[PDB]
Structure 1
């Protein structure tokens, strides 16, 4: 649905740095350099951002009251 707050394996907080990564990778930058700049060294954390889908935005159209 929405970006997880913490990496599952090691608990590092990565929930606040998804939008910056998406924007800088849509701006034509090298994804590896962007991930290195953001400070994610262990690949257990890179796996979280590299493979996420924002499915929240296309389910708010249906309201249940």
Structure 2
């Protein structure tokens, strides 16, 4: 849905890094280099950013009022 605030495994905060990672990867930079620059060294943290889906945009359209 929306990017998790913390890594499920070790609790490192990765909420802010997702949008930077997405824009840098779309810019054409190497994903490994981007993830290293962001500070995610453990592959548990890299799993959180690499496998996340922004589903909030696709469901914001329907309101419950």
Same fold (TM over 0.5): yes
Matches within 5 A, 1:1-65: 1-65=1-65
1:60 Cα offset (Å): 1.0
Normalised to the residue count of structure 2, the TM-score between the two structures is 0.97
**Is the helix fraction higher in 1 or 2?**
2
> Deviation per CA, 1:9-53, whole angstroms, max 9, x where unpaired?
100000011000000000000000000000001000000000010
1:54 Cα offset (Å): 0.4
Give the secondary-structure state (helix, strand or coil) at the position aligned to 1:45.
helix
Structure 1 unmatched runs, 5+? none
Give the secondary-structure state (helix, strand or coil) at the position aligned to 1:58.
helix
Give the secondary-structure state (helix, strand or coil) at the position aligned to 2:57.
coil
Normalised to the residue count of structure 1, the TM-score between the two structures is 0.97
What is the aligned length?
65
Structure 2 unmatched runs, 5+? none
